[PDB]
């Protein structure tokens, strides 16, 4: 199944064959979310999923890019991601080009920025933190946590999610170990988007643009209620292609919407497979 952090969805032929598609995992999820997408793609299309690793967005691309080079050498590279997955796809695209590699397609599946830019002041930190606590107060019962006022600052990424365990567990609630792990990696991963700096990219990038964020994203950060037509990428990508697919961010990876993604996407993998001559 899984070698290191690389999941095989469809192995590439012993010899020759088409170009593999590299997909990257979403926050709190594995790359089997790309199985519908793979269904809507040309037949013997290889597909390989990059699973979670630790670090900032830049730290994670430094582990992925060597593995990409081991698998695909100089190119051509097809890089596809949904949600956080597209941010990971973009970083790897940057990193591969900086080493002179041939990246010919970057597919962003509604990897869309909050319309207006998210402030990173004290007051907004406190604020988005309450809206995170709000989730834990409805989901795991426990309407009785507490808000810190300077504890938040001094703690790091891990200390912060560790701090919410100490709070919920002393209510008397036993969160199952598997649920704790999942919430923890969802936190670290969404936090790595928080701090990431986008770099400019002069290659082709396709944004598959749904039309709205689902409800619990707006609950955490209401700036996700509005979207720009470019998704926040227009400043950084000269050759940006926006493809409509409608629906909500959470639906974009699924049937039926994924069918519009993969129909277009097959209209590029055909172009690439051609331009291999
Ligand atoms: C120029 O800059 C640009 C340009 C273009 C860009 N595109 C993107 C992009 O592709 N994506 C991926 C899809 N996205 C999400 O899925 C959201 C992620 C946060 N969110 C949430 N929702 C819940 C329910 C929980 C959490 C969470 O736990 N947060 C951690 C945290 C931090 C602090 C306090 C408390 C918790 N987060 C709602 C969904 C948005 C980001 C980014 C980006 C960009 O900036 C880097």
Author numbering: 1451 to 1727
Q: What does the primary publication say about this deposited structure?
A:
Pks13 is a multidomain enzyme that performs the final step in the synthesis of mycolic acids through the condensation of a long-chain fatty acid (C24–C26) and a very long-chain fatty acid (C56).12 The product is transferred from Pks13 to trehalose by the Pks13-TE domain. Pks13 fulfills a critical function for Mtb by performing a condensation reaction of a long-chain fatty acid and a very long-chain meromycolic acid to form a mycolic acid. Pks13-TE is a validated target for the development of antibiotics for Mtb. In previous work, we identified TAM16, a potent lead molecule for Pks13-TE. X-ray crystallography verified that compounds from all three different series were binding deep within the active site of Pks13-TE, displacing the side chain of Arg1563 with atoms within about 4 Å from the catalytic Ser1533 OG.
The structure of the series 2 compound X20419 in complex with Pks13-TE was solved using X-ray diffraction data collected to 2.2 Å resolution. Crystals were in the tetragonal P41212 space group with one molecule per asymmetric unit. X20419 was found to reside within the same channel as that for X20404, extending through the core of Pks13-TE via a conformational change in the Arg1563 side chain. Most of the contacts between the protein and the inhibitor are VDW/hydrophobic interactions with the addition of two hydrogen bonds: between the N9 of the indole ring of R1 and the carbonyl of Ala1561, at 3.3 Å, and a weak bond between the catalytic Ser1533 OG to the carbonyl (O21) of the inhibitor, at 3.2 Å. The terminal aromatic ring system of R1 forms VDW interactions with the carbons of the Arg1563 side chain. Two methoxy substituents on the ring contact the Ile1648, Ile1643, and Tyr1686 side chains. The piperidine ring of R1 is angled to achieve a pi-stacking interaction between the pyrimidine ring and Phe1670. The piperidine overlaps with the position of the piperidine in the TAM16-bound structure, while the pyrimidine extends into a space occupied by the benzofuran of TAM16, without causing the Phe1670 side chain flip. The enamine linker of R2 places the terminal phenyl into a hydrophobic pocket created by the side chains of the Phe1670, Tyr1637, Arg1572, Arg1641, and Trp1579. The C16 of the piperidine is also 3.4 Å away from the catalytic Ser1533 OG, in addition to the H-bond to O21, thoroughly blocking substrate access.
